[PDB]
Design a protein around this ligand. Sequence first.
Ligand SMILES: CCCCCCCCCCCCCCCC(=O)O
Ligand SMILES: CCCCCCCCCCCCCCCC(=O)O
Ligand SMILES: CCCCCCCCCCCCCCCC(=O)O
Ligand SMILES: CCCCCCCCCCCCCCCC(=O)O
Ligand SMILES: CCCCCCCCCCCCCCCC(=O)O
Ligand SMILES: CCCCCCCCCCCCCCCC(=O)O
Ligand SMILES: CCCCCCCCCCCCCCCC(=O)O
Length: 264
Amino acid sequence: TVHTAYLVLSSLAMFTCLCGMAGNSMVIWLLGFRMHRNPFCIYILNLAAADLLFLFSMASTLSLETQPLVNTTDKVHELMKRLMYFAYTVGLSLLTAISTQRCLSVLFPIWFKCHRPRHLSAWVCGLLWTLCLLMNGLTSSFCSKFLKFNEDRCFRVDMVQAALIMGVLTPVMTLSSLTLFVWVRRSSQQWRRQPTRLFVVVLASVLVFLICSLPLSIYWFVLYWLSLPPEMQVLCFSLSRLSSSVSSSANPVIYFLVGSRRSH
Ligand SMILES: CCCCCCCCCCCCCCCC(=O)O
Ligand SMILES: CCCCCCCCCCCCCCCC(=O)O
Ligand SMILES: CCCCCCCCCCCCCCCC(=O)O
Ligand SMILES: CCCCCCCCCCCCCCCC(=O)O
Ligand SMILES: CCCCCCCCCCCCCCCC(=O)O
Ligand SMILES: CCCCCCCCCCCCCCCC(=O)O
Ligand SMILES: CCCCCCCCCCCCCCCC(=O)O
């Protein structure tokens, strides 16, 4: 029944949350202060931190939804839900940044080598964290039922957040990955041996992004603008949570173990 399909879909989410926390802790330990001559490692460290925050927040959320939410809980529950959302948004922004950096490394290699600011990843990540925190401090301040809660303002701030996420982070990331794919297939695979690994990893990252991370972003959009039945909305929420869980738990595998050159 519905309860069984919720319990099963939440147990998997908790298990993959624990696995993702372990993987991101390993990535932070193995890359926190080293491997930093690489221009690609600052984004990966920040993404690992963001994914660890996401998985910890939503693991706590899933743990404390078993308990009744009346007076003691349901106040930390909202805090950790906003933490989950903020970490999800910053992780999506960091994935877009990683894909754009990879595309620029091959579209403009001279700039990436001898003209890129050496701290550009650092303050790009700082700007992403600051902007995500600011946007989530508006979504929470206008839609949480423990703050200056409103009805006409929640819808506007959500139509800002979801529209920005989808119609900016999806086109930019997918277009950058497609351009990198096309450039490698045309100007690099034609002369020497075809880099099948590059095609495989780019396609896998794009597929994981679109099929796993984006469902949680579009669930907020389809909650409004459409009269979803209240019985099946919990199923959609569970699907979105598990998809984002899988994406965050697999990010260390497809961004660190694949990109492990100093660990050799
Ligand atoms: C409100 C949106 C503002 C714009 C956000 C754009 C996020 C993706 C692009 C910026 C991050 C990556 C920039 C290139 C990184 C690099 O190659 O050094
Ligand atoms: C406001 C949105 C865009 C933010 C862009 C932040 C900086 C991104 C990294 C540098 C992009 C340009 C790279 C060199 C391009 C070139 O000259 O060929
Ligand atoms: C919550 C706001 C702050 C979030 C973190 C800010 C960005 C931190 C970036 C990683 C650590 C600094 C890295 C600087 C560059 C380097 O050491 O090579
Ligand atoms: C990093 C992604 C998000 C980047 C942009 C963050 C801020 C988005 C907009 C916030 C809500 C603004 C709503 C309108 C406010 C007004 O008209 O006064
Ligand atoms: C403190 C940093 C994170 C939050 C930054 C964004 C601004 C938060 C507050 C937004 C609402 C401001 C107006 C409140 C009006 C009211 O009291 O109803
Ligand atoms: C991470 C910080 C985000 C911004 C928060 C700014 C403060 C928003 C207002 C909080 C008011 C709390 C007390 C009144 C609550 C209520 O009237 O419902
Ligand atoms: C990451 C952004 C977090 C923004 C702040 C979220 C706060 C959610 C509510 C927490 C409990 C607030 C309790 C005091 C106000 C009240 O009495 O309702």
